[PDB]
Design a protein around this ligand. Sequence first.
Ligand SMILES: [Zn+2]
Ligand SMILES: [Zn+2]
Lengths: 289, 289
Amino acid sequence: MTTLAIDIGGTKLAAALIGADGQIRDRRELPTPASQTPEALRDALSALVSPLQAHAQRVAIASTGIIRDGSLLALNPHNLGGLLHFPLVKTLEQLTNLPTIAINDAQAAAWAEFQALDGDITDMVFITVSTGVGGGVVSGCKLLTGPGGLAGHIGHTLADPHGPVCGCGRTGCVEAIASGRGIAAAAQGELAGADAKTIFTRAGQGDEQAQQLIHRSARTLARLIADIKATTDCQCVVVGGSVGLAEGYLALVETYLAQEPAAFHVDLLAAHYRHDAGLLGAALLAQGE
Amino acid sequence: MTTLAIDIGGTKLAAALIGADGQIRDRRELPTPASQTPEALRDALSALVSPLQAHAQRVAIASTGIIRDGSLLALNPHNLGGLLHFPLVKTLEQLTNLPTIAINDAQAAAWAEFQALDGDITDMVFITVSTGVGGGVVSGCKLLTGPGGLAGHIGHTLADPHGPVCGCGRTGCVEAIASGRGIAAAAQGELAGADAKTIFTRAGQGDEQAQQLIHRSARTLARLIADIKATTDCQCVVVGGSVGLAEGYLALVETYLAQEPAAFHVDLLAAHYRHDAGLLGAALLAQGE
Ligand SMILES: [Zn+2]
Ligand SMILES: [Zn+2]
């Protein structure tokens, strides 16, 4: 059995063929349509999966946003345009005639990271810090998606009631402070307008402000991890994404978490997959269907 | 078959016989020993359950603090004295010769509250606000205890990084602001020294400081509920405890939650059980054993 694995992001629509061995084969890519209409996405998904769909027996989609009742939702619904409640699972099922599942991309990535761990771990939380902050919760070897697909949206838990307004509408989410976008938005002076990448580079050269923006991110993430430990009693936390995997970042988080009381401590690990974890995690979930 | 349900708290040790009908029968009570030695707790438990133990098939203990490997832990290990790592399950097993389970009291209460709900809810979070703040998470009709018995400790998640220091050692926990002890601790002027009950009365009479202390607690709890919704995707939140059940309190929490973006909204319900939910929950959890 081969899974047609799809990753639906904001900028790119990716698809691959993944068999039982978990290898990524025939990796295809298309840009995400600028026009956010249901017709345009159905066109782009059909075009993306055509040359692959005869070689697969089931479809699995990792999507940015929220999947509820097989349909596309977001924390800021206005960002989807005409794609709000787009029937994502039904669309593929019509286009391919193949059984289809859809999950949030950070939930998909979480499952992949969990399966990459040793067999003794039953409870794990995954956090990705990139442009945004996403998460996924595994409890008793089961991925928690939630009845509405929201579970693990830990980037949108509170970091500071007097912090910046987040894109979701809340004041002071973890994401508004700790993400690459929040790091960049807090930048003043000669750092104003620089992206997270540049800021990490400047911090590497001993730029004090750049360093503090990153310390603030890592401190925010450490407190989140303490929160999640208190809530879920996870046995380890896997940290990924372009910010999360940036050199020295995990060490910073670990150092700040160590300052919390011993009961809130949890083992931290670097993400095993740098790329394509959503694609992989989606295919792995489709194997248990 | 009948469960010898036990509730171990800071002040009082309670025990009852509870059959399949859920009727609390032959309820007894004893004060918790001031000398926190294992010998004194063993004696006080032995005395409490000796008239009941010949009429039960199993023991179930709802306990304050943390239950890890059948032993007593807390978020402040110094607060247990010689009772840190007290082999709670083992003690009962030796005293009664009955199969014994132990669980956190708020986790116990959560399970009872979940069962008293209608059949459609699969995902529920329980929050109790009294002297402290405790919780329990039910996901997919299963109570999440956590591998170390921690899960659902939502009173000790972050409310404000510049908030008051909590008894667990963290700065700015929900509990340190929103709980009855949190409300009493922030009272200034003539209000200083008044308990949460007095503060609640004076608030209803138009005392602006007292009202601010309760508004602050209600607002803090709303933000916690928004966090928990983001993390668990719970379908409803049941709120209990002397503070949580206080007149007007839940409606105020509900008002504050409604100011958050729509995705963070979740139905709030008053606790079905005002007393003895721990005993009931423990016996209910013992039934599925
Ligand atoms: Zn947010
Ligand atoms: Zn605390």
